[PDB]
Design a protein around this nucleic acid. Structure first.
Lengths: 735, 249, 716, 95
RNA sequence: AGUAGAAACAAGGCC
RNA sequence: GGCCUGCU
């Protein structure tokens, strides 16, 4: 007899055992080298899906741009980006009519937010493409570098501390004859108008790793800092709009998505009488981002912001204006090998414009030949369409408009449709009195989608009777069925620290028990395995064992020293008291009454040199990138113990010409620590104002010395010493 | 005394003097987050990879003057080589366990008073009474429920001023809290935590967690109470219901 | 008017007033009289505060110039002259230290004698109105208020004047100096009434310059300016434009539904080529175990001593010789490496105490076997351009290979029971709730079912091997290291036992990226002759190292005993994911527990015990030439565990792609079997998407064969 | 304090139509004797009433409507509007 | 050789 | 041969 697990589906329905079809127990695919090939392929594919448009050359950037809008209507089922302006404007108008007051309200709240938003909001972001160094750097670092360059060039309106003023300075920089940047190898280099325009309109391309569910790798993009404020405002407007649309599912979580899917299916099927047939289409959109033209987003926003202050319209329109002229950096480059001479070489992507094509294979040779005409200063113009879901929410708005355009008031026919859209994925429930009606409805829906630059993937889509469908790895079969294979990768040690890892593991087990219908015995097994892996990872074994490690000696002496050994934490080699009933309690508090007072005091000592807290945002928040989803943050319950240390940093900056960044880091951190000691609320509430550091610090020294004498340790001798030391630092700052 | 003294020492050197002079208060946050350290994409892989090194964690410089450089057999506990972009020094994990067996001891009696939420959870569970398990299909319907069982009927911003006035009474600014509920909360949490020396930031964070109301959407069947939702994993399942009554009731 | 503040007042005050001007964001060129008025207010604040000191008594000491001493206390300490944030900082600090009441507006000074605030304001109008005006602005105030006015008069409540009168003569002399100096200037046409409390501003975000031209190039094809396009949008109204283009659009743009029937789906085509080879990092079906029967636990013990003790338990060693060559390497190197390992093992046996971890010598043998100094040296392009052989890295579709029957048998025997327990679980909090007791009983049942399973043994082998390899790579980056493959089990009798499959030599492991490869050489004992399925051992070199005698009724077999030696490699990501193989247990048993719960939701009672003991119900878990064979729930547990283990062992992008694109077709087939009239828009496209994932991986090809068999058995 | 005023209701024959309006999310609920308060509509509608009743709104002048078509003997009850925390007084509908 | 698979590893750089 | 780094 030959064993075959798949035959199990002959008795258990597919959805009731779908977890077996998710090989999420092995290493996910990773990219190894350059992503330049993928970037070039994506650029060429985006440009050839809109080949029948019209070509122009921008007078500012001098780059060739392709406009397919209002182009010839498609005559085949292949992907097409020839969106029609009038059709999309009409779709938005019908969306407004079905939801009166949506645009005006959303614009009002967006106007409030834009005029009260601060610059620091831009620091709350992941890697961004700093143009000062032409590389990806943390959002805060890139923002600081750009602000420094602007201030050195004379653009100091951002000193007002307002994001709108920062954007005003950004736009004013566009009209400057010559800017100056700094490079280390420090050298001051001058950038002319066109070079700075291209550096501000460019995107950095990388390869996406840890992407499960496809054989081929893809490319993703990261924009600069000049354009992120406009993107933030536009996405704020789009989120405020989608929050008023029940057909959208992008700005919500997973459980809300499931609830809305259940509600829509029940509404569609229940209202349908015996005569009307119902069919569900589990649709995926092929080349979703490559076929969405930024000009059409400009049209949608300018229709949304009608009868609004002109400044609001301008600030919200700046973003799509820059995306329509966006450029993409090709990537890291290409690495060549010569086996005859036994050597390797790494050529940067910027040489692709001039480098001969003898080194490249046929596929890459043709890709380079096709993309060369669009190469301007080492970057390729990508006007026709978006690169990687930067305007997720606006795309969801367009999809929701398409979905609502079939409310049976615009169809003008017996058939009708509804459903749920989340960018690149949708479920469409279509009802009609007969199979011919369903066919006509789906055909018209597809045709209308093709008029908006949205394509339906026929290969990854199928239609059945309502009651069974899929949506973003959520399988609905007369009710959503748990999978538990999507969350399997999150059952190990997170990698934050000991206490954080313990709390995160127990909380993940608890949550997957609540949401993903994890069984009790399975949860106990998960707890046991997690504890085993945790002890084997942090070298913290039970203590009563003879497992020799680098940490087994101190742990054993602590074990033999303690009297009530049941109170020792698993991190210190103690027994595990966790169970299904204790999954919502931190380890420290669960073992508090069992700890010896000496060990308890040594553990939770504020003066410990290991605990370090930076800001209110990073107290008990851990960023865990979930499998098959975007990066997410979780609140984990933990007590600040000596085990809450933060791990070592990379330390490879020491071998790079960018070595002075560490000295600047140290000096900035010293100044920030001094300010915090002067202003204790610096972390919890970020200080605001327009004065400089030393003014506030010296003046508060004055006052605090005064009052702490009026009652406290200070003495006249010390108070006068502080006053004249303040005068000394004053005259020092003078010179 | 000291604080202004390292201030003067910083202003002595030209670079830090320039940083202090030209940098305005508003930019405080930016430069504080200014770092070359990228946020890790795969934390688990490197935590499993770094812990195999010697000196994998980081600690303040003060550790060099509280913990000896080596233990009884000579296993090193800390190194004097500083981190990449900080004055902290890289140290071995043993320096943690050492601190828990011969490090300085204090009076942790006030931690229960600080971490009110967690200890209240423990007390509620310790006095709970279980019941028979009933096996029948559960119609889990998804609903918006409040998870925090100690929220004082305050929002984030609404309680943020209360938290500042409780911890940072001088940086409150214009705000003087009007609602009398906030008055009593301030009085109680002021007299209760009058000399607690854990940290201002952690105290503020835990006060925010305790007082601020927070809500999330979850699949529930029955219950719906704040105390009954924290144990939602233990009382409700796919085909079984476990009757439970927390210690509070 | 600004010429006056150019002339008279000192710098300090003028820049203080200029920063106060910047504070609230209004411009000085439009209205300057406010600047002069508030700078005079600030000047009176200084001149009233300075020159006034106190000592330990009350009765302020007044000195025209502060002498060098600790006695420089200031009688009145200023509030204004600071930012709003700091003004409120001082207010709150004074309130919290003085125990006084917090005012709602900005004071100007604080004093000790009377322990309270002073709000100085000198207005153009006479005092006896401005005083009570600001008084009714401030609610129930105990802070004393004092104001002057140009005529020279003073006033205050309580008839209180807080310091010397010569200072006030100073104030009013300053005041009339101001007055009869404007007399020379001539400003009272507006000086009395120049500020009325204007607060208004309009936010301006103007597109101009280059950024405007960009806006003119981001419009539809037939538009010339953003102004015109916005006007058109504002004037646009729906007039049935979607219908017109829908009618005009070609009818070939359709989404016709192709019915999906029993005869529609065709079997997935498998690639053809040379048979598929073995990819695992260790032997799974052909492993052999040398044991000692020690009482130590899994992690307890020292590796090298245990390995040597286990190997000494076997007698019959022969001089090794080549049996099956690598066919691409230098087998004599493998032979010499094996003999070197034996020699150095003896060398450890001789000395005092077995080292916890041993380093081996870097001979040419393992230099070749571990691929040392073979990475091409990195150079610059400008120095290597004329080399004809210089080209890209080989980037093409992997070699095509057809499925072989060995993977099927390997999976078959990976789901079989064993004579040992390969899982020793940790401790949990004592169960207190009845649901916890039910969970514990279920867990005990599953552990009894799966512990005696080859899948669990493979899990432990992989976890231990990858953990040791990762730790050695991170610790001994430079020097080659010896690691014996160890796994500890427990017999039926209950006696604990150790097992030594072989050895692993780890090489240089300077791993920077998650994809960087660490090469090692693995040696494993076995009894399976490699002359029967050679195509499965394409990358192995197999020697003959001894003879084994296992008790059998046919005299005694005296079988040969071979050594499978190969060069393999891994990476940080692969090591990390292989050291988390225990979650296969989770996956499998979560699936089984979901089955049990779903069935128990029907009958209102827990159904675990009868499922595991009666074994009445069975699921299709394989096909025999007679037909489909069904097994008890325990066999399903073992089968799913083996499937998860093989997923973790043979993981690859092919597996992910095939899994997704075959789950799609499985859902379609399930819809067909449920009588839900399934339909497809392009089924050929889906088939081509599935078939492109099957290239050379044995596991994915076996999965595809299983899928074809399931289709054949289904659709009936 | 925001408050709701129902209008509409009256006697109506079996199979006939009514328009309710509620001046001030938004929902309509109804209550008879014998049983309890019953959810009508919020667009979302409880199954018993689908296709028969249409809830609609007009933000512009603070009003929510219930169009009730194809009325039945069982549709007799007091109809209430509500909003999110608040209720109106009621208007009786008798079919 | 080996790992791996649309491009890489099989140490890097600095003296 | 000596020393530096391992997400920069």
């Amino acid at each position: 007899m030959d064993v075959n697990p798949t035959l199990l589906f002959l008795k258990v329905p597919a959805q009731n055992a779908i977890s077996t079809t998710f090989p999420y127990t092995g290493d996910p695919p990773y990219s190894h080298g350059t992503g330049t090939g993928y970037t070039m392929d994506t650029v060429n594919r985006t440009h050839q899906y809109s080949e029948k448009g019209r070509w122009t050359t921008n007078t500012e950037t001098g780059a060739p741009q392709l406009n397919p809008i209002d182009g010839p209507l498609p005559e085949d089922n292949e992907p097409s980006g020839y969106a029609q302006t009038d059709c999309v404007l009409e779709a938005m108008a019908f969306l407004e009519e079905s939801h009166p007051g949506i645009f005006e309200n959303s614009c009002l709240e967006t106007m409030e937010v834009v005029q009260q938003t601060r610059v620091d909001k831009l620091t709350q972001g992941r890697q961004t493409y700093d143009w000062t160094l032409n590389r990806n750097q943390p959002a805060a670092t890139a923002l600081a570098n750009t602000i420094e360059v602007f201030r050195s060039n004379g653009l100091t309106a951002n000193e007002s501390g307002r994001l709108i003023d920062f954007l005003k300075d950004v736009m004013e920089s566009m009209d400057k004859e010559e800017m100056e940047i700094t490079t280390h190898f420090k050298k001051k280099q001058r950038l002319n108008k066109r070079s700075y325009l291209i550096r501000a309109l460019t995107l950095n391309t990388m390869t996406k790793d840890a992407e499960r569910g496809k054989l081929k790798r893809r490319a993703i993009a990261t924009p600069g800092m000049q354009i992120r404020g406009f993107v933030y405002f536009v996405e704020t407007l789009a989120r405020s709009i989608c929050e008023k649309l029940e057909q959208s599912g992008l700005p919500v979580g997973g459980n809300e998505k499931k609830a809305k899917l259940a509600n829509v299916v029940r509404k569609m099927m229940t209202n349908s009488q015996d005569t009307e047939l119902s069919f569900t289409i589990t649709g995926d959109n092929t080349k979703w981002n490559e076929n969405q033209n930024p000009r059409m987003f400009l049209a949608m926003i300018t229709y949304i912001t009608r009868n609004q202050p002109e400044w609001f319209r301008n600030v919200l329109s700046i973003a799509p204006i820059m995306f329509s002229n966006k450029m993409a950096r090709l990537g890291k480059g290409y690495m060549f090998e010569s086996k005859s001479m036994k050597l390797r070489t790494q050529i940067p992507a910027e040489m692709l414009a001039s480098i001969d094509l003898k080194y490249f294979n046929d596929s890459t040779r043709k890709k380079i030949e096709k993309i060369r005409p669009l190469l301007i200063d080492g970057t390729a113009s990508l006007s026709p369409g978006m690169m990687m879901g930067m305007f997720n929410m606006l795309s969801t708005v367009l999809g929701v408009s398409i979905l609502n355009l079939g409310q049976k008031r615009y169809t003008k026919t017996t058939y009708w449709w509804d459903g749920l859209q989340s960018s690149d994925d949708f479920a469409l429930i279509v009802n009609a009195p007969n199979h011919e009606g369903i066919q006509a409805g789906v055909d018209r829906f597809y045709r209308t989608c093709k008029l908006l630059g949205i394509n339906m993937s026929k290969k990854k889509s199928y239609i059945n009777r309502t009651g069974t469908f899929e949506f973003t790895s959520f399988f609905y079969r007369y009710g959503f069925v748990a999978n538990f294979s999507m969350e399997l990768p999150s059952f190990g040690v997170s990698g934050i620290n000991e206490s954080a890892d313990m709390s995160i593991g127990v909380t993940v087990i608890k949550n997957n028990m609540i949401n993903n219908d994890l069984g009790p015995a399975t949860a106990q097994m998960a707890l046991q395995l997690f504890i085993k892996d945790y002890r084997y990872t942090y070298r913290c074994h039970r203590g009563d064992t003879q497992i020799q490690t680098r940490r087994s000696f101190e742990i054993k002496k602590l074990w033999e020293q303690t009297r009530s050994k049941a109170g020792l934490l698993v991190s210190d080699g103690g027994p595990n008291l966790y169970n299904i009933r204790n999954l919502h309690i931190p380890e420290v508090c669960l073992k508090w009454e069992l700890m010896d007072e000496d060990y308890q005091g040594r553990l939770c000592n504020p003066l410990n040199p290991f605990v370090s807290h930076k800001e209110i945002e990073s107290v008990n928040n851990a960023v865990m990138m979930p499998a098959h989803g975007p990066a997410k943050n979780m609140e984990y319950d933990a007590v600040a113990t000596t085990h809450s240390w933060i791990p070592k940093r990379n330390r490879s900056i020491l071998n790079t010409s960018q070595r002075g960044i560490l000295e600047d880091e140290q000096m900035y951190q010293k100044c920030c620590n001094l300010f915090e000691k002067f202003f204790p609320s610096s972390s919890y509430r970020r200080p605001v104002g327009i004065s400089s550091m030393v003014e506030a610090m010296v003046s508060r020294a004055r006052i605090d010395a005064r009052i702490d004498f009026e009652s406290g340790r200070i003495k006249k001798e010390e108070f006068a010493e502080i006053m004249k030391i303040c005068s000394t630092i004053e005259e020092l700052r003078r010179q | 005394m000291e604080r202004i003294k390292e201030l003067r020492d910083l202003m002595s050197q030209s670079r830090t003097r320039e940083i202090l002079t030209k940098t305005t208060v508003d930019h405080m946050a930016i430069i504080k987050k200014y770092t070359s350290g990228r946020q890790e994409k795969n934390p688990a892989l490197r935590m499993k990879w770094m812990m195999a090194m010697k000196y994998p964690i980081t600690a303040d410089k003060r550790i060099m003057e509280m913990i000896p450089e080596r233990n009884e057999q000579g296993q090193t506990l800390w190194s004097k080589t500083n981190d990449a972009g900080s004055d902290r020094v890289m140290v071995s994990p043993l320096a943690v366990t050492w601190w828990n067996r011969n490090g300085p001891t204090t009076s942790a009696v006030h931690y229960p008073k600080i971490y009110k939420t967690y200890f209240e959870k423990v007390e509620r569970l310790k006095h709970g009474t279980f019941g028979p398990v009933h096996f029948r299909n559960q119609v889990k319907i998804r609903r918006r429920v409040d998870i925090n069982p100690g929220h004082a009927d305050l929002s984030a911003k609404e309680a943020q001023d209360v938290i500042m006035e409780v911890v940072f009474p001088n940086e409150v600014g214009a705000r003087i809290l009007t609602s009398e509920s906030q008055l009593t909360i301030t009085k109680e949490k002021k007299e209760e935590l009058q000399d607690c020396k854990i940290s201002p930031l952690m105290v503020a964070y835990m006060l925010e967690r305790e007082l601020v109301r927070k809500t999330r959407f979850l699949p529930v069947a029955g219950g719906t109470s704040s105390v009954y939702i924290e144990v939602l994993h233990l009382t409700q399942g796919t085909c079984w219901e476990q009757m439970y009554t927390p210690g509070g009731e | 008017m600004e010429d006056f503040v150019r002339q008279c007042f000192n710098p300090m005050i003028v820049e203080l007033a200029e920063k106060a001007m910047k504070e609230y964001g209004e411009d000085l060129k439009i209205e300057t009289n406010k600047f002069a008025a508030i700078c005079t207010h600030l000047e009176v604040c200084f001149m009233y505060s300075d020159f006034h000191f106190i000592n330990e008594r009350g009765e302020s000491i007044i000195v025209e110039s502060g002498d060098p001493n600790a006695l420089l206390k200031h009688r009145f300490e200023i509030i204004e002259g600071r930012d709003r944030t700091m003004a409120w900082t001082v207010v709150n600090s004074i309130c919290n230290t003085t125990g006084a009441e917090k005012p709602k507006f900005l004071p100007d000074l604080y004093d000790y004698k009377e322990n309270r605030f002073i709000e100085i304001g000198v207005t153009r109008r006479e005092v006896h109105i401005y005083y009570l005006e600001k008084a009714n602005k401030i609610k129930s105030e105990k802070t004393h208020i004092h104001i002057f006015s140009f005529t020279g008069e003073e006033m205050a409540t309580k008839a209180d004047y807080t310091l010397d009168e010569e200072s006030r003569a100073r104030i009013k002399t300053r005041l009339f100096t101001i007055r009869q100096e404007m007399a020379s200037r001539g400003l009272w046409d507006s000086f009395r009434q120049s500020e009325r409390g204007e607060e208004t501003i309009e936010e301006r975000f103007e597109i101009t310059g280059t950024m405007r031209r960009l806006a003119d190039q981001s419009l539809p094809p037939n538009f010339s300016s953003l102004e015109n396009f916005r006007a058109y949008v504002d004037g646009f109204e729906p007039n049935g434009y979607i219908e017109g283009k829908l009618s005009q659009m070609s009818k070939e743009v359709n989404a016709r539904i192709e019915p999906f029937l029993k005869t529609t789906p065709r079997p997935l085509r498998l690639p053809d080529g040379p048979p598929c080879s073995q990819r695992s990092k260790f032997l799974l079906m052909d492993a052999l175990k040398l044991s000692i029967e020690d009482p130590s636990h899994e992690g307890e013990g020292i590796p090298l001593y245990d390995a040597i003790k286990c190997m000494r338990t076997f007698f019959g060693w022969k001089e090794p010789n080549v049996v099956k060559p690598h066919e691409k390497g230098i087998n004599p190197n493998y032979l010499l490496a094996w003999k070197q390992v034996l020699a150095e093992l003896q060398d450890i046996e001789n000395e005092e105490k077995i080292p916890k971890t041993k380093n081996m010598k870097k001979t040419s043998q393992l230099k070749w076997a571990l691929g040392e100094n073979m990475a091409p040296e990195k150079v610059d392009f400008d120095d290597c351009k004329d080399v004809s052989d210089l080209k890209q890295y080989d980037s093409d579709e992997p070699e095509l290979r057809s499925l072989a029957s060995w993977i099927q048998s390997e999976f078959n025997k990976a789901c079989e029971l064993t004579d040992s327990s390969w899982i020793e679980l940790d401790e949990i909090g004592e169960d207190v709730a009845p649901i916890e007791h039910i969970a514990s009983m279920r867990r005990n049942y599953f552990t009894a079912e799966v512990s005696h399973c080859r899948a669990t043994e493979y899990i432990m082998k992989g976890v231990y091997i990858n953990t040791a390899l990762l730790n050695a790579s991170c610790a001994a980056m430079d020097d080659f290291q010896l690691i014996p493959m160890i796994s500890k089990c427990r017999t039926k009798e209950g006696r604990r036992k150790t097992n030594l499959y072989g050895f692993i030599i780890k090489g240089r492991s300077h791993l920077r990226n998650d994809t960087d490869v660490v090469n090692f050489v693995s040696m494993e004992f076995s009894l399976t002759d490699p002359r029967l399925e050679p195509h499965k051992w394409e990358k192995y070199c197999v020697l003959e190292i001894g003879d084994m005698l296992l008790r059998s009724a046919i005299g005694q077999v005296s079988r040969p005993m071979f050594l499978y030696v190969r060069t393999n490699g891994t990476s940080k990501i692969k090591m990390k994911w292989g050291m988390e193989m225990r979650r296969c247990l989770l996956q499998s048993l979560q699936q089984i527990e979901s089955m049990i719960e779903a069935e128990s939701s029907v009958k209102e009672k827990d159904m675990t015990k009868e499922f595991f003991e009666n074994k009445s119900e069975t699921w299709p878990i394989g096909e025999s030439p007679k037909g489909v064979e069904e097994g008890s729930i325990g066999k399903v547990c073992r089968t799913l565990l083996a499937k998860s283990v093989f997923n973790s062992l043979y993981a690859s992008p092919q597996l992910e792609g095939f899994s997704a694109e075959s789950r799609k077709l499985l859902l379609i087939v399930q819809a067909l079997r449920d009588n839900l009239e399934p339909g497809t828009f392009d089924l050929g496209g889906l088939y081509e998407a599935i078939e492109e994932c099957l290239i050379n991986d044995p596991w994915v090809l076996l999965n595809a064969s299983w899928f074809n068999s399931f289709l054949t058995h289904a659709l009936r | 304090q925001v408050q709701l005023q129902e209008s509409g209701g009256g006697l109506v024959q079996a199979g006939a139509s009514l328009r309710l309006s509620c001046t001030a999310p938004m929902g309509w609920f109804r209550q008879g004797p014998g049983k309890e308060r019953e959810f009508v509509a919020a667009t979302y509608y409880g199954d018993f009433v689908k296709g028969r009743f249409t809830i609609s709104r007009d933000n512009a002048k603070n009003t929510v409507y219930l169009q009730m078509n194809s009325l039945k003997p069982e549709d007799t009850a007091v109809y209430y509007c509500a909003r999110a925390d608040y209720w109106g007084q009621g208007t009786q509908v008798t079919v």
